[PDB]
């Protein structure tokens, strides 16, 4: 009866968010995706456009994190 929002992080390998959307028993609404600058999200958008219209997907990117070398960018990602 709850809205049951889903929150997921995405790497350089897509087709994980479509998989995790199919939890056996959950009626997900407003899937949220958190990712970096580089990786592509066309596959996820096409999936949610063709198989689940009313789910209002949102995608968020961290402004200056594309690869990690020091600990500084991990902290900004966490914040």
């Amino acid at each position: 009866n709850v809205q049951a929002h889903l929150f997921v992080s995405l790497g350089t390998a897509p087709a994980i968010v479509p998989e995790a959307f199919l939890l056996p028993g959950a009626r997900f609404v407003s899937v949220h995706v958190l990712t970096t600058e580089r990786p592509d999200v066309t596959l996820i958008r096409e999936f949610f456009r063709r198989h689940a219209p009313g789910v209002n997907l949102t995608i968020t990117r961290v402004a200056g994190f594309q690869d990690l070398k020091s600990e500084e960018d991990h902290f900004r990602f966490e914040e």
Binding site: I59, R76, E78
Partner: protein, 457 residues
């Protein structure tokens, strides 16, 4: 792979996004690039978890802590809290100066007796022509720490420049009240009870008028300083009227006058969040012939009307005067009970009944003499009273005559009894809180205010 559910922390479950917002760099349809201005939430979470960990670490011996917030301190600070206080270290002096304090023994007529304060009080009179000529009694050599004690006569004569010789003028009295309140606020005191003798200042006015002026001045001072959270005055002041007893002369009609005035005034003003008359005091010259049980039929009316009583006892008398004050006059607090240790049964009775004891280190040193730095009057009984369970507090008595404040009094108390710790100072503050003449709501508010105001090392 289903790991399971989670609960989280109660004060982070709901929170609000307005406190920690996100900044959008650029946005197309259903895609965003975000940025955080700073790392406030990280510090918030870190200190929250640190507080939780410290509270978990210190959960036992929590009933033994005078205040609850001490359970949020680290192990090192708690260990530092148990070490003997060092009066000579600047850090300890600053720590003592920063503590919230409660005052219970302060005479109004002995505040501005020397120096610039006397001149400021004098240059406020409504009738400067009637002012007595200026004169300042000369203090003994090394006055704050005299080499030899002096009797009470010289001690009282040391404040002849102020008091009955100066407070007949309404302006002088009003300025005296303002300056005392300013000093109390500067010292960090959050609650104080002030003793006064209004009938001594009435010559053309009635004692009712003098008391009304004093109460109005203190109330206006409280109204002016609405600092502190909740919109409450920085310092709260209540009043106690003195019944003075003398060696010879006419002094017993004035006593009845003060008690009647106190009863009427206590019934007059009843607002909880305002200056009020909360008790009576029996002070003055003490000996065998003027013991507390000779004034019982005068205090029967006060006992009928339900007012609290405090008695000066034990300063210049054996434990018999203390016993008579406790059991014949139904006293709730005791002043300068330096001879309480002579009787074990009386000490047990006082400890069991919860009767408070009030000591003034500087005045006691100046009048009786006591060894400093652990180098005959005997040892100063503060540690004995703490160990036996007595509700004992440290006060200032006469600020002007003794030339010392509450911070100096606490430091000198540390000097009189080597081995006194800072936790002992916190226990003294708690004792003063539990012994004060106030309502339960005010007591709870004061406890909450004091607990979250103790500075860290």
């Amino acid at each position: 792979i289903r790991l399971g559910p989670e609960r989280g922390w109660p004060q982070l479950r709901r929170i609000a996004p307005e406190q920690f917002p996100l900044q959008v760099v650029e946005e197309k349809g259903d895609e965003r690039r975000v940025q955080a201005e700073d790392r406030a939430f990280g510090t918030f979470l870190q200190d929250l978890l640190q507080r939780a960990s410290r509270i978990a670490g210190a959960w036992e011996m929590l009933p033994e802590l005078p205040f609850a917030d001490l359970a949020t301190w680290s192990e090192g600070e708690l260990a530092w809290l148990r070490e003997p206080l060092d009066p000579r270290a600047p850090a300890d002096q600053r720590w003592v100066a920063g503590l919230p304090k409660i005052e219970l023994h302060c005479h109004l007529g002995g505040f501005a007796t020397h120096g610039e304060l006397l001149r400021r009080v004098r240059n406020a009179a409504e009738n400067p022509g009637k002012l007595p000529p200026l004169e300042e009694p000369r203090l003994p050599e090394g006055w704050p720490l005299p080499a030899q004690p002096i009797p009470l006569a010289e001690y009282m004569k040391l404040g002849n420049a102020n008091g009955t010789a100066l407070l007949r003028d309404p302006g002088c009295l009003r300025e005296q009240c303002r300056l005392l309140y300013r000093h109390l606020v500067d010292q960090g005191v959050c609650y104080a009870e002030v003793r006064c003798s209004p009938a001594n200042y009435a010559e053309v006015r009635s004692p009712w008028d003098v008391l009304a002026d004093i109460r109005a001045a203190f109330q206006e001072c409280m109204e002016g300083a609405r600092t502190a959270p909740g919109g409450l005055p920085a310092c709260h002041v209540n009043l106690i009227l003195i019944a003075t007893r003398r060696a010879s002369g006419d002094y017993r009609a004035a006593i009845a006058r003060h008690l009647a005035l106190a009863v009427t005034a206590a019934e007059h003003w009843r607002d909880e969040n305002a200056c009020r008359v909360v008790g009576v005091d029996l002070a003055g010259y003490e000996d065998e012939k003027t013991r507390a049980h000779y004034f019982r039929e005068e205090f029967t009316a006060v006992h009928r009307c339900g007012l609290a009583v405090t008695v000066h006892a034990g300063e210049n008398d054996d434990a018999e005067g203390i016993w008579r004050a406790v059991f014949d006059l139904n006293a709730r607090r005791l002043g300068h009970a330096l001879s309480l240790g002579q009787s074990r049964e009386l000490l047990r009775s006082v400890a069991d009944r919860g009767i408070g004891v009030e000591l003034c280190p500087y005045a006691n040193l100046q009048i009786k003499g006591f060894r400093l730095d652990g180098s005959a009057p005997g040892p100063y009984p503060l540690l004995d009273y703490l160990r036996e369970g007595v509700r004992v507090t440290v006060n200032t008595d006469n600020i002007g005559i003794s030339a010392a404040s509450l911070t100096d009094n606490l430091l000198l108390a540390a000097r009189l009894c080597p081995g006194l710790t800072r936790l002992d100072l916190l226990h003294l503050q708690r004792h003063a809180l539990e012994t004060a003449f106030c309502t339960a709501t005010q007591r709870l508010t004061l406890l909450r205010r004091i607990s979250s105001g103790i500075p860290r090392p």
